[PDB]
Design a protein around this nucleic acid. Structure first.
Lengths: 62, 62
DNA sequence: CTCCTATGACTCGTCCAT
DNA sequence: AATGGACGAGTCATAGGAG
């Protein structure tokens, strides 16, 4: 098995990698929220589009 | 000047609070993603409802 | 059980802010 | 200032994975 000092080096490395991956996770989650919100905004504007569509078509029919 | 031992214990509390607040950020963000996915499904429903409704009204223009 | 990595908890030294 | 508060990072013990 690894000697004490070498074990400390490997664990220092593991700690830094695990802390780094925690930052990456936050960044991934934040970016998901962002694009979900913008997707959301585009669908909302679409429904608004299709709603002014149907009101117009209803006027043509009658 | 604070006694070193009083510092040590205030530092332990500080570190503990920071761990908790980090977990709460992860929660909030993961919850936000969940909620937004939901709203994306409702607005997609409403999208396809208004769409096949315009398809109807177009046929009705004959 | 061994042997390794990942992670919560702890401490220390250092930076921030005044 | 000297010092309260904040926080990066090294360390330890241990869970969990792979034997």
């Amino acid at each position: 098995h690894m000697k004490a000092e070498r074990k400390r080096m490997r664990n220092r490395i593991a700690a830094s990698k695990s802390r780094k991956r925690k930052l990456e996770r936050i960044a991934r989650l934040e970016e998901k929220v962002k694009t979900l919100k913008a997707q959301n905004s585009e669908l909302a504007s679409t429904a608004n589009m299709l709603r002014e569509q149907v009101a117009q078509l209803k006027q043509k029919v009658m």
